Design an enzyme around this catalytic site. Structure first.
Site, PDB file in Angstrom:
ATOM      1  N   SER A  59       0.875  -1.203   0.000  1.00 18.14           N
ATOM      2  CA  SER A  59       0.000   0.000   0.000  1.00 18.14           C
ATOM      3  C   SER A  59       0.899   1.237   0.000  1.00 18.14           C
ATOM      4  CB  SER A  59      -0.919   0.029   1.170  1.00 18.14           C
ATOM      5  OG  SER A  59      -1.582   1.273   1.243  1.00 18.14           O
TER       6      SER A  59
ATOM      7  N   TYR B  72      -3.451  -0.872   9.806  1.00 17.67           N
ATOM      8  CA  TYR B  72      -3.259  -1.529   8.498  1.00 17.67           C
ATOM      9  C   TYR B  72      -1.821  -1.309   8.020  1.00 17.67           C
ATOM     10  CZ  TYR B  72      -4.133  -2.254   3.448  1.00 17.67           C
ATOM     11  OH  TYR B  72      -4.088  -2.634   2.150  1.00 17.67           O
TER      12      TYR B  72
END
Lengths: 231, 244
Positions: free
Chosen positions: A149, A162
């Site tokens: 990400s 996350y």
């Protein structure tokens, strides 16, 4: 257009989003794709039906991730499916795409130990153990692709939990790339972003990395953010 | 595969090494390739002859880089060749591959102002001005690929002057990616690898005159439509040599 003929690929979390678009694109290149899902069987079956309508080959594999027996259950379904369709259990390509997410995010002051455990168990520990198991079936020239990400490089407080797991995922890329280099197995991170895009834009990058022409890329961070990491 | 049918490409320094291998691979994908050279005409002609044997289309273009007039001379030859073959001067793909390299180490205490000037004139200033001129001919979907060096991430004192110019080249990638994103043109760095004395692949190619085809296959991917979501990036094509 047919760069992956005779290869077997597992895409974790391929019932939707980037996972689905990646399964679709690997199958268009001739890969037999195991479409892994946790519990949405309808979405998994949609992915497989889309692949078969386009002339490719795929099958669903069910396994809850982040729980006792997850790697064993996934590989039992994967090996049975590959053996039925190819006569072998060979795994050429592993895409670590499955993840626990929270689109609305958690404020750092509200993150619980249990959320930290769930995020870690699925997003960092399962990929490490899936890599360890996968390489027992993976020949020289294999591919491991970790979907990371842009959050590992762009501060967003409500996504700290996350992002931690993706920081840990990227370390699998660095250290396992060095480890698996003598077998000619590459390990790479592909980072999507947080102009209208589609899941296919990132999946085209993953597809390239799964092919022979990426052989000189290993241990890399591949920015597929559509330029959103630029500032 | 025919991913680049009807596209026009310029590869600077394509008489040998990564540049030749990139020219060959773009032509195999259907691109019309301008094979740029400074002075080795015979080697440029052999790049073009290989492309023609393999069924593709290419032409040589001469310009010494890193001197006043270099961009204008190169673009006169480029536009004449493109227009003769296609009726247009459209440039879809620019690979900034030409470079002056540290074939020998220079100890930092021995680096001269003149060396710093020559390295920068070719490796940083020429690519900036080639990008500026190229985008006047480049439509939506264009590709600009800067061939950098793993030396921008691996300390080698004897290569400091060369590495400075690659550091500047990578800033072209970052700032021009953001600038050209509204026209749908992507700008990316591809970094070949390194191998007592540490050299990069372009340096090893020059010494013998990290295989050039392995780097060129990455550049070829970046030149295609399927790289549209990669811009402003550093693409490690070091064959794992940046892992150490």
């Amino acid at each position: 257009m047919s760069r992956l003929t005779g290869k077997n690929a597992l895409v974790t979390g391929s019932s939707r989003g980037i996972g689905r678009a990646t399964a679709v694109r690997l199958a268009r290149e001739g890969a037999l794709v195991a479409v892994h899902y946790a519990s949405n069987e309808a979405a998994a079956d949609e992915t497989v039906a889309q692949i078969e309508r386009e002339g490719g080959r795929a099958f669903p594999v069910r396994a809850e991730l982040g729980v006792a027996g997850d790697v064993h259950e996934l590989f039992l379904g994967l090996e049975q499916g590959l053996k039925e369709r190819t006569g072998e259990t060979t795994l050429d390509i592993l895409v670590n795409n499955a993840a626990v997410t929270g689109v609305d995010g958690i404020l750092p002051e509200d993150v619980t130990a249990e959320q930290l455990d769930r995020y870690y168990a699925v997003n960092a520990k399962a990929p490490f153990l899936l890599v360890q198991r996968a390489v027992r079936n993976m020949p020289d020239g294999g591919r491991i692709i970790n979907i990371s990400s842009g959050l590992t490089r762009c501060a967003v407080p409500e996504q700290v939990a996350y992002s931690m797991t993706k920081g840990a995922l990227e370390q699998i890329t660095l250290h396992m790339a060095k480890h698996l280099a003598p077998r000619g197995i590459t390990v790479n991170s592909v980072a999507p972003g947080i102009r209208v895009g589609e899941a296919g834009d990132v999946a085209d990058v993953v597809t390239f990395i799964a092919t022979d022409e990426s052989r000189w890329i290993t241990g890399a961070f591949i920015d597929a953010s559509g330029g959103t990491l630029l500032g």
